[PDB]
Design a protein around this motif. Structure first.
Motif, PDB file in Angstrom:
ATOM      1  N   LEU A   3       0.804  -1.218   0.000  1.00 38.92           N
ATOM      2  CA  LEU A   3       0.000   0.000   0.000  1.00 38.92           C
ATOM      3  C   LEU A   3       0.838   1.270   0.000  1.00 38.92           C
ATOM      4  O   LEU A   3       0.643   2.171  -0.828  1.00 38.92           O
ATOM      5  N   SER A   4       1.771   1.353   0.932  1.00 37.19           N
ATOM      6  CA  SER A   4       2.640   2.517   1.045  1.00 37.19           C
ATOM      7  C   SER A   4       3.572   2.655  -0.135  1.00 37.19           C
ATOM      8  O   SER A   4       3.899   3.767  -0.551  1.00 37.19           O
ATOM      9  N   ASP A   5       4.047   1.542  -0.692  1.00 37.90           N
ATOM     10  CA  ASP A   5       4.991   1.624  -1.810  1.00 37.90           C
ATOM     11  C   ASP A   5       4.381   2.176  -3.091  1.00 37.90           C
ATOM     12  O   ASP A   5       5.075   2.648  -3.990  1.00 37.90           O
ATOM     13  N   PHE A   6       3.060   2.104  -3.207  1.00 43.36           N
ATOM     14  CA  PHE A   6       2.375   2.554  -4.423  1.00 43.36           C
ATOM     15  C   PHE A   6       1.146   3.380  -4.144  1.00 43.36           C
ATOM     16  O   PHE A   6       0.044   2.934  -4.454  1.00 43.36           O
ATOM     17  N   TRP A 122       2.235 -18.604  -9.638  1.00 40.38           N
ATOM     18  CA  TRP A 122       2.176 -17.504  -8.678  1.00 40.38           C
ATOM     19  C   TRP A 122       1.257 -16.417  -9.272  1.00 40.38           C
ATOM     20  O   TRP A 122       1.555 -15.881 -10.318  1.00 40.38           O
ATOM     21  N   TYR A 123       0.208 -16.106  -8.531  1.00 40.74           N
ATOM     22  CA  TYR A 123      -0.763 -15.138  -9.042  1.00 40.74           C
ATOM     23  C   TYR A 123      -0.945 -13.885  -8.223  1.00 40.74           C
ATOM     24  O   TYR A 123      -0.818 -13.839  -7.001  1.00 40.74           O
ATOM     25  N   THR A 124      -1.375 -12.836  -8.933  1.00 44.19           N
ATOM     26  CA  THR A 124      -1.787 -11.570  -8.351  1.00 44.19           C
ATOM     27  C   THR A 124      -3.116 -11.167  -9.009  1.00 44.19           C
ATOM     28  O   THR A 124      -3.216 -11.284 -10.242  1.00 44.19           O
ATOM     29  N   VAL A 125      -4.111 -10.778  -8.267  1.00 44.44           N
ATOM     30  CA  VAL A 125      -5.388 -10.364  -8.815  1.00 44.44           C
ATOM     31  C   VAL A 125      -5.669  -8.948  -8.351  1.00 44.44           C
ATOM     32  O   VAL A 125      -5.589  -8.711  -7.151  1.00 44.44           O
ATOM     33  N   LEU A 126      -5.930  -8.059  -9.320  1.00 44.33           N
ATOM     34  CA  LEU A 126      -6.229  -6.676  -9.035  1.00 44.33           C
ATOM     35  C   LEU A 126      -7.595  -6.401  -9.630  1.00 44.33           C
ATOM     36  O   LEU A 126      -7.902  -6.923 -10.708  1.00 44.33           O
ATOM     37  N   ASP A 127      -8.362  -5.561  -8.993  1.00 48.33           N
ATOM     38  CA  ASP A 127      -9.679  -5.165  -9.419  1.00 48.33           C
ATOM     39  C   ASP A 127      -9.632  -3.649  -9.590  1.00 48.33           C
ATOM     40  O   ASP A 127      -9.306  -2.987  -8.607  1.00 48.33           O
ATOM     41  N   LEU A 220       3.484  -3.630 -12.402  1.00 46.39           N
ATOM     42  CA  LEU A 220       2.106  -3.429 -12.889  1.00 46.39           C
ATOM     43  C   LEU A 220       1.387  -2.310 -12.149  1.00 46.39           C
ATOM     44  O   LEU A 220       0.758  -1.392 -12.705  1.00 46.39           O
ATOM     45  N   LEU A 221       1.535  -2.312 -10.807  1.00 46.86           N
ATOM     46  CA  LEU A 221       0.921  -1.260 -10.004  1.00 46.86           C
ATOM     47  C   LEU A 221       1.490   0.099 -10.384  1.00 46.86           C
ATOM     48  O   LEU A 221       0.809   1.125 -10.569  1.00 46.86           O
ATOM     49  N   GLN A 222       2.805   0.158 -10.546  1.00 46.24           N
ATOM     50  CA  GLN A 222       3.469   1.407 -10.899  1.00 46.24           C
ATOM     51  C   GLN A 222       2.971   1.912 -12.249  1.00 46.24           C
ATOM     52  O   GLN A 222       2.668   3.103 -12.405  1.00 46.24           O
ATOM     53  N   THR A 223       2.847   0.999 -13.199  1.00 48.25           N
ATOM     54  CA  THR A 223       2.351   1.391 -14.521  1.00 48.25           C
ATOM     55  C   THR A 223       0.885   1.835 -14.426  1.00 48.25           C
ATOM     56  O   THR A 223       0.494   2.846 -14.993  1.00 48.25           O
TER      57      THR A 223
END
Length: 255
Positions: A3-6, A122-127, A220-223
């Motif tokens: 959270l804090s990093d992005f 290894w997965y990451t799910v973003l909404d 991905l978050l950064q982009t």
DNA sequence: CTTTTTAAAAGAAAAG
DNA sequence: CTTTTCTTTTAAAAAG
């Protein structure tokens, strides 16, 4: 500390999104369409009070703006549980029938998931939050989506409309999916090794190792944050070998 | 609220 | 009268 990093990537910390690289959208009408103005059905005070805070918030965000338009469609209060927490629902069916059809490019979930190899566990799910609202509407196309709003006996004189792609519009899901595919095309090129599945506002990043998934997620978050999209920090499922995606439970390369 | 369409129940019409 | 099946209209259920 994802959270804090992005701070910019999370809806919780970066404020309402805005896809800055996407041109405002122009919505072509069918060759014979003419504006239709449908009367607003009388709304009870209870429904109006429940909806008011949502409308005011949209006006403060600039997502809704006053206007005078030859188009008008009905606003419908949809009570989730009961007499509490209302939410404005626009009936755009008469506008949808007048707008030119586009080819549906959003893949069905079953076919999208076919592109997930067993090597990537290894997965990451973003909404993405309020995804459609991140896309601007061109000013020429804003009048199409106008509706009437009345502080009972005074205030905003009459109509409001959207400055962003609206809910209930038949092409929103496709247009959003195509815009985000354009905005993440580079990301995919800089990360050949990662798998990225997109289903309108539901994204799944898949990697071969936990580190790759962590480095891929960060990128991905950064982009997404830089492009102006916002992910739900609350729902995020980060770097797990088990996640929920599009109604499936992903695990062991199953489902 | 209004339109759409999907489904199930009720009411005529053949038939022996 | 009773069973069959065909029509048709009444009701729920998605949907914006």
């Amino acid at each position: 500390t994802w959270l804090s990093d992005f701070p910019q990537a999370w809806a919780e910390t970066g404020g309402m999104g805005l896809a800055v690289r996407q041109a405002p959208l122009i919505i072509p009408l069918k060759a014979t369409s003419t504006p239709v103005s449908i009367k607003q059905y009388p709304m009870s005070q209870e429904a109006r009070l429940g909806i008011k805070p949502h409308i005011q918030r949209l006006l403060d965000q600039g997502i809704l703006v006053p206007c005078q338009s030859p188009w008008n469609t009905p606003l419908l209060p949809v009570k989730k549980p009961g007499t509490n927490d209302y939410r404005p629902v626009q009936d755009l069916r008469e506008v949808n029938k007048r707008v030119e059809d586009i080819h549906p490019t959003v893949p069905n979930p079953y076919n999208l998931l076919s592109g997930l190899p067993p090597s990537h566990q290894w997965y990451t799910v973003l909404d993405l939050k309020d995804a459609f609202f991140c896309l601007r509407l061109h000013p020429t196309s804003q009048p199409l989506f106008a509706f009437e709003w009345r502080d009972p006996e005074m205030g905003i004189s009459g109509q409001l409309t959207w400055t962003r792609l609206p809910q209930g519009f038949k092409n929103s899901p496709t247009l959003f999916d195509e815009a985000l595919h354009r905005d993440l095309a580079d990301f995919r090129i800089q990360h050949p090794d990662l798998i990225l599945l997109q289903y309108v506002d539901d994204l799944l990043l898949a990697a071969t190792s936990e580190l790759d998934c962590q480095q891929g997620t960060r990128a991905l978050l950064q982009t997404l944050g830089n492009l102006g999209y916002r992910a739900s920090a609350k729902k995020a499922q980060i770097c797990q070998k088990q996640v929920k995606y599009l109604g499936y439970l992903l695990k062991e390369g199953q489902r």
